[PDB]
């Protein structure tokens, strides 16, 4: 079984970044103003580490 690896909680602090590409992909980020995990549309490329596939993953990581 796979041991837990150390996580970088500063990854929750970036602004949401849709990136430059034009796909329509639902992702989640921790919003440092509202202090809540929120949905945003990701274009499929680039961005930053404040990008989670599901709300619960964002909540587990960031709240």
């Amino acid at each position, epitope marked *: 079984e796979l041991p837990p690896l150390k996580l970088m909680h500063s*990854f929750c602090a970036f602004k949401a970044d849709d990136g430059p590409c034009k796909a329509i992909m639902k992702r989640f980020f921790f919003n440092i103003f509202t202090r809540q995990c929120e949905e945003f549309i990701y274009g499929g*490329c680039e961005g930053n580490q404040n990008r989670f596939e599901s709300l619960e993953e964002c909540k587990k990581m960031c709240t």
Partner: antibody
Amino acid sequence: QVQLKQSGPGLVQPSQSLSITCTVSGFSLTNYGVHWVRQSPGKGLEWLAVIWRGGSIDYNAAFMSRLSITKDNSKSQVFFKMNSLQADDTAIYYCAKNSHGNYVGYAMDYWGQGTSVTVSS
Amino acid sequence: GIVMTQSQKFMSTTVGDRVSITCKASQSVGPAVAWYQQKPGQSPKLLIYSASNRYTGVPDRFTGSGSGADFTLTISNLHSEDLADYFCQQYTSYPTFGGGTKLEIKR
């Protein structure tokens, strides 16, 4: 014990498609993303894309329009396809497990054995 | 994308010595840097993640250091089995890799 075993033919004629199957064991595709990276003498290691546990994909913008990544969780299989290969796509292609579950921003801890791809007529 | 530069393509080393491999990012990447080891014919192996964390089972003679744009992998006591290629990697906007540093034996 984690393993990623690649299968699929590596000889590709000009502008044809490359298809590789990555069959994983020791972990679930329901819990981990799987990356695709290639390595060539000319361009070194180049990351291409990752398929996350719920099927969402992040792409390298330079390859996005000719990449198709799918998977079958039940069979522990990820399917990589790249269209219209050119001579400069000759490289070793790897699948690799995301180190940190379903999270962006870390590393790739277990790698497939690689597929040597030759683009030539 | 971010460019990771390893200025030393080749380093000549001696068993038992300390060896330091440098990597510079074209702009700040914070701590999101990993190091890999690779030998001919084989796939990369992960040594270090998040700049300074040893991966599972990696010998404790490997240390990663650095933040921002400058990163260093140090082997405190080079073993023969450490002769290999070493690559840095950042994962901010997307993963990119350094060009590699190959250790060789001085003779």
